[PDB]
Nucleic acid binder design. Structure first.
Ligand SMILES: [Zn+2]
Ligand SMILES: [Zn+2]
Lengths: 62, 906, 116
RNA sequence: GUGAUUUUAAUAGCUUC
RNA sequence: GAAGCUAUUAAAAU
């Protein structure tokens, strides 16, 4: 319940960022992809929350 | 002390005893023997020699040794005569014949601790926990420091690619040994002495020491048999890169490289000189260009030498050999001949330098040929990869990204309402749509660096291919016409550069049956190189690997169909064989497959495995072997020239061809392409070959004196004889070995996947392969290290294969009988439901087929001991009801519809 | 299927004629006519005839090793750097390629050079 | 810009029985 | 209806 919500929210967030034309900025796209993959590969809620808020800060910045 | 100083003799050297006083030491070493009683290359004990460690002026132990041998007075008198005849050779060690207490003593002075037999056995029977001899050899000969072995996984070829350099540090020593054995063979020939040369009678300095079984004849008629020596030594040459010194001037490692001309491509005389310099006394005839060979066996034999000689020559001399023709006065650049790394030089026969005009067939050929595309492009230098960069077709580099997968919130929330995804659940989400960056395509293409030039033991491979061909004698093959070809989905890519104008339907509708037949007849007399395009695959997985696939061109696909369609359909149609391609898992087709492999083995245990990076690491020799095996069905429709030209086309199109990745051309080192017309069948042939080789090595590496069964001992003896002492094929023994394999090592094969039922007493005694006899074969013939992670074992038959085709197995009751049901991974099913590739497919009311199909594959779980596993199927049935109710057939949400899909009656 | 074919036939010929205009006929003729029988490997034609080179550099260490300075040498020839472009197809000046601005740069860089 | 092969399901049409 | 065939769409395996 804790992890599944984080991973689904990460998927939705990265899809939204892709729709917002982030691929144009390769340096942003690389970090977004790396954070998304690390969240999906994470195991405990502690690091998933941190990478999730890090990924959400990118959306908040635009 | 008296014995020690007598051994010292006139060769002044301080020697310390190596043993217990004046006695005979007992060592365990590898030997190669062919007595009428025992035959094979294995490890035995030596108690007939006394060792004498040698020291220097600093009085610390060095690698020199004084070995004295006590044997029949007859051996003494004889060997002494043979040594007197062969005194002058510099490749012969020093012997001092004497008698001490009056037992004769033959003294071998200045010898290393280990031999070439020890080295070859250590590298060809590698074990991760029994590598003491290899580690000691590497430390002794300054190949690596003693602390190199504290680095974990130092032996991998993937995780630790520096072990390649560590191994290659032995190339000069191996080359010196080769030159010394050539000298010894020439000396015997001059003296007039016949005898068999074996690895265990040669020192790591290249010095020969045993002479008991050399018969003396008249001078000038000396005959040295070296078949077993060279064949057992062959795999180590490429591994240690013995011939790496030939690229320098005067073959000196301290000199600069040779500046070969850029326009030179022939190298026939260089290959002949290399063969005469190294393999001078090899009996069989060698053809530098395989177009002059006489059979598929001869093609294999000569290509095995070519893969080794091709490392001397520069890498820019391989590929299409272009020319300059004039179409009605307009000059063009077309590829005429081709230079293979394994097949030499091939020249087309239908070459016309003045075409008044070109029709559809000629336009297709010239558009598929990459000469124009490479010639019109710009030079490319790409430091992102280690592959050869041929050119750049555009003025920009293209970067491909992979998007994330969509999310099905309706299904996810329904599953949450149904009590899944709860904390601590054994059923969790593991499969997702991983996203990649721009450089994922090139990063994954660079994984071809795992393809290393591998040379095979040709005498073993020639028997293995004959045994493997028995597995395919129950099929029907041949060439069909253009109107008998079946194409499943005509709306697919036609490859580069054809995908800029239409799909695969356009060309099939455009060119008629006559033109297709003309193109096929053209491909049997000329070579047509083609460009392959690498595309990214967008799928659900448990690992973030940007999987890439190869889109072969229509010019290759059409003519490969017209060549292999019949045999591939026959293989897919046959039921109850070793290859189970085409057998459905529905309506008891699972049970029927598992019963066929359980067969009637005596002490049954089950085992299985999968290949690490099968496509990237597959050696080109094995790829050509599989192609020849598949093409063996054309004994009546095609001649030798036609079959060779078809093989050349297949190699030049799907083995090492120019590859397009983002508007740039790179050459493929080798391996296999996932877009071939014969990928799965070639993989099956390769799998069977590796298994048969494992069995052969396991049988031959066993002490024949410990085998109690007279039949098995005789079988091992005749196996060794038919492998190394007979040059022709023995059909009776091929049949006998095939029957032995079928009786005690049964197999079920689907591409790179295999499940095996075997006798667990023969495996215990070493008469059939094991999961250890397969790491050894892979380590020396596929340049990979198989771990215990792709290897499973099951001593039980009730519990079936641990894993086959990604399904597990269960013994459930279907009525009155017990059947076996394949069940997949819940996580996989839930991930397929929750995450979708297309945004449109998130509407539940418009996509019922997806959930119907997913419920068919999730049905078996209903009968699993774990309750929370079985609740996955009922989730899909409750969601199907909702979709129909929101939309507005009760059959979909009734269990019996899916229950009918795993029932024997059709 | 008949006029559908007649469309792609003139498409292949147009491409097969556009690439001929791109051939360096002044230099290609020398290479072909210097062979033993007019037959040469394909992998050397771009190397010895191409008048333009594109280099893709992963990072600054490789840049410094390979394409240092305005003019470098490769394949037994002298090439003069003409333009540098990052992964975003943004014009990059030679001044800001250094240790300090490497993190700010968006690698890889695609260097375009002309033969001397 | 999206490969080769195998099995299965669904809708629709057609001809046989 | 029994069965066969053609077309489109979808899921799985390699
Ligand atoms: Zn030959
Ligand atoms: Zn044929």
């Amino acid at each position: 319940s804790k992890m599944s919500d984080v991973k689904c929210t990460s998927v939705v967030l990265l899809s939204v960022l892709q729709q917002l034309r982030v691929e144009s900025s390769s340096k942003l796209w690389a970090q977004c992809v790396q954070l998304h993959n690390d969240i999906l590969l994470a195991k405990d809620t502690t690091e998933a929350f941190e990478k999730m808020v890090s990924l959400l800060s990118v959306l908040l910045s635009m | 002390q008296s014995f020690l100083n007598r051994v010292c003799g006139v060769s002044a050297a301080r020697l310390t005893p190596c043993g217990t006083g004046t006695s005979t030491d007992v060592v365990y070493r590898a030997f190669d023997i062919y007595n009428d009683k025992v035959a094979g290359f294995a490890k035995f004990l030596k108690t007939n020699c006394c060792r004498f460690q040698e020291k220097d002026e600093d009085d610390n132990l060095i690698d020199s040794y004084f070995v004295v041998k006590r044997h029949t007075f007859s051996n003494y008198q004889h060997e002494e005569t043979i040594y007197n005849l062969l005194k002058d050779c510099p490749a012969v060690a020093k012997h001092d014949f004497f008698k001490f207490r009056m037992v004769p003593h033959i003294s071998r002075q200045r010898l290393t601790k280990y031999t070439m037999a020890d080295l070859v056995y250590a590298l060809r029977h590698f074990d991760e926990g029994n590598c003491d001899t290899l580690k000691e050899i590497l430390v002794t000969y300054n190949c690596c420091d003693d602390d190199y072995f504290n680095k974990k996984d130092w032996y991998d070829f993937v995780e630790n690619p520096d072990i390649l350099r560590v191994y290659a540090n032995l190339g000069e020593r191996v080359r010196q040994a080769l030159l010394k054995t050539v000298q010894f063979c020439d000396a015997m020939r001059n003296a007039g002495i016949v005898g068999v040369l074996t690895l265990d009678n040669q020192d790591l300095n290249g010095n020969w020491y045993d002479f008991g079984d050399f018969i003396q004849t008249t001078p000038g008629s000396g005959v040295p048999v070296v078949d077993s020596y060279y064949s057992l030594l062959m795999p180590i040459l490429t591994l240690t890169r013995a011939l790496t010194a030939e690229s320098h001037v005067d073959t000196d490692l301290t000199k600069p490289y040779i500046k070969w001309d850029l326009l030179k491509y022939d190298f026939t005389e260089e290959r002949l000189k290399l063969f005469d310099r190294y393999f001078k006394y090899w009996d069989q005839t060698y053809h530098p260009n395989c177009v002059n060979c006489l059979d598929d066996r001869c093609i294999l034999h000569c290509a095995n030498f070519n893969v080794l000689f091709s490392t001397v020559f520069p890498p820019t001399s391989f590929g299409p050999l272009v020319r300059k023709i004039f179409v009605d006065g307009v000059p063009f650049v077309v590829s005429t001949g081709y230079h293979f790394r394994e097949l030499g030089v091939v020249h087309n026969q239908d070459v016309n330098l003045h075409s008044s005009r070109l029709s559809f067939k000629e336009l297709l050929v010239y558009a598929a040929d990459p000469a124009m595309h490479a010639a019109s492009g710009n030079l490319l230098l790409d430091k992102r990869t280690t592959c050869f960069s041929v050119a750049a077709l555009t003025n920009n580099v293209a970067f491909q990204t992979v998007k994330p997968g969509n999310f099905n919130k309706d299904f996810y929330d329904f599953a949450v309402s149904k009590g899944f995804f709860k904390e601590g659940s054994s059923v969790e989400l593991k499969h997702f749509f991983f996203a990649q960056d721009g450089n994922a395509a090139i990063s994954d293409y660079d994984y071809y660096r795992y393809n290393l030039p591998t040379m095979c033991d040709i005498r073993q491979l020639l028997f293995v291919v004959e045994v493997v061909d028995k597995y395919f004698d129950c099929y029907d093959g041949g060439c069909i016409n253009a109107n008998q070809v079946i194409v499943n989905n005509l709306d697919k890519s036609a490859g580069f550069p054809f995908n800029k104008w239409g799909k695969a339907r356009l060309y099939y509708d455009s060119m008629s049956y006559e033109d297709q037949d003309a193109l096929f007849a053209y491909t049997k007399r000329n070579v047509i190189p083609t460009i392959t395009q690498m595309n990214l695959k967008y799928a659900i997985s448990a690992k973030n690997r940007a999987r890439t696939v190869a889109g072969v061109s229509i010019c290759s696909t059409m003519t490969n169909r017209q060549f292999h369609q019949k045999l591939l359909k026959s293989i897919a149609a046959t039921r109850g064989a070793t290859v189970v391609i085409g057998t459905s898992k529905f309506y008891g087709g699972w049970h029927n497959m598992l019963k066929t492999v359980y067969s009637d083995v005596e002490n049954p245990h089950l085992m299985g495995w999968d290949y690490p990076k099968c496509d990237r690491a597959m050696p080109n020799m094995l790829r050509i072997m599989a192609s020849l095996v598949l093409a063996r069905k054309h004994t009546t429709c095609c001649s030798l020239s036609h079959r060779f030209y078809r093989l050349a086309n297949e190699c030049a199109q799907v083995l090492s061809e120019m590859v397009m990745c983002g508007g740039s051309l790179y050459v493929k080192p080798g391996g296999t392409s996932s877009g071939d017309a014969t990928t799965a069948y070639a993989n099956s042939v390769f799998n069977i070959c590796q298994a048969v080789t494992a069995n052969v090595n396991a049988l031959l590496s066993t002490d024949g004196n410990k085998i109690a069964d007279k039949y098995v001992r005789n079988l091992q003896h005749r196996l060794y004889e038919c492998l190394y002492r007979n040059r022709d094929v023995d059909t009776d023994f091929v049949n006998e070995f095939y029957a032995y394999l079928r009786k005690h090592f049964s197999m079920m094969i689907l591409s790179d996947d295999a499940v095996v039922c075997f006798n667990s007493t023969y495996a215990s005694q070493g008469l059939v392969a094991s999961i250890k006899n397969f790491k050894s074969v892979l380590y020396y013939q596929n340049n990979v290290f198989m771990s215990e992670a792709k290897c499973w074992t099951e001593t039980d038959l009730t519990k079936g294969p641990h894993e086959f085709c990604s399904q597990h197995t269960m013994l459930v009751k279907q009525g009155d009988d017990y059947v076996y049901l394949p069940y997949p991974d819940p996580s996989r099913i839930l991930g397929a439901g929750c995450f979708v590739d297309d945004i449109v497919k998130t509407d539940g009311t418009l996509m019922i087929e997806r959930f119907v199909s997913l419920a068919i594959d999730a049905y078996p779980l209903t009968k699993h001991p774990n309750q929370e596993y079985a609740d996955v199927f009922h989730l899909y049935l409750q969601y199907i009801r909702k979709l129909h109710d929101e939309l507005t057939t009760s059959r979909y949400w009734e269990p019996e519809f899916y229950e009918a899909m795993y029932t024997p009656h059709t | 299927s008949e006029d559908k074919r007649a469309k792609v036939t003139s498409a292949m010929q147009t491409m097969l004629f556009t690439m001929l205009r791109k051939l360096d006929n002044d230099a290609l003729n020398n290479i072909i006519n210097n062979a033993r029988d007019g037959c040469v490997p394909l992998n050397i034609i771009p190397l010895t005839t191409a008048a333009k080179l594109m280099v893709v550099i992963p990072d600054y260490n490789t840049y410094k090793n390979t394409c240092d300075g305005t003019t470098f040498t490769y394949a037994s020839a002298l090439w003069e750097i003409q333009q540098v472009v990052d992964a975003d197809s943004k014009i990059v000046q030679l001044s800001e390629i250094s240790m300090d601005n490497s993190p700010n740069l968006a690698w890889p860089l695609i260097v375009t050079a002309l033969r001397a």
